[PDB]
């Protein structure tokens, strides 16, 4: 499983989440103690198939995202 991925490599099958409150909700949902400021999520079959975070609120293609789910 690839545990790290460059933002620039997140295609259209992913969605960016920046809303502070939604990030918090998601993190609790998946049970993560990590504190990213933005998420890249892949939604699948009515659930979150993947959840990745970046420590920056603004997404830069060069940032490295880390998989949380």
* Owner of token pair 């609120």: 57
- Please tell me the total count of domains within the chain: 1
Distance CA 37, CA 56 (A): 6
Q: Starting at the earlier edge strand, list the strands of the sheet with 47-54.
A: 4-6, 64-67, 47-54, 38-44, 15-17
Q: What is the CATH number of the domain that holds 25?
A: 3.10.450.450
Q: What range does the domain containing 53 cover?
A: 2-69
> What number of other Cβ atoms are within 10 A of residue 24's Cβ?
11
Outline where DSSP puts E strands in 1-69.
4-6, 15-17, 38-44, 47-54, 64-67
Which residues, including other chains, have CB under 8 Å from residue 15's CB and lie 6 or more apart?
Answer: 40, 41, 42, 43
């Amino acid at each position: 499983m690839k545990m790290r991925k460059l933002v620039k490599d997140f295609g259209d099958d992913y969605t960016l989440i920046q809303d502070s409150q939604e990030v918090k909700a998601i993190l609790e949902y998946i049970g993560s103690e990590e504190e990213p400021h933005a998420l890249f999520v892949k939604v699948g079959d009515g659930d979150y198939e993947e959840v990745w975070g970046i420590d920056s609120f603004v997404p830069y293609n060069f940032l490295e995202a880390y998989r949380l789910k």
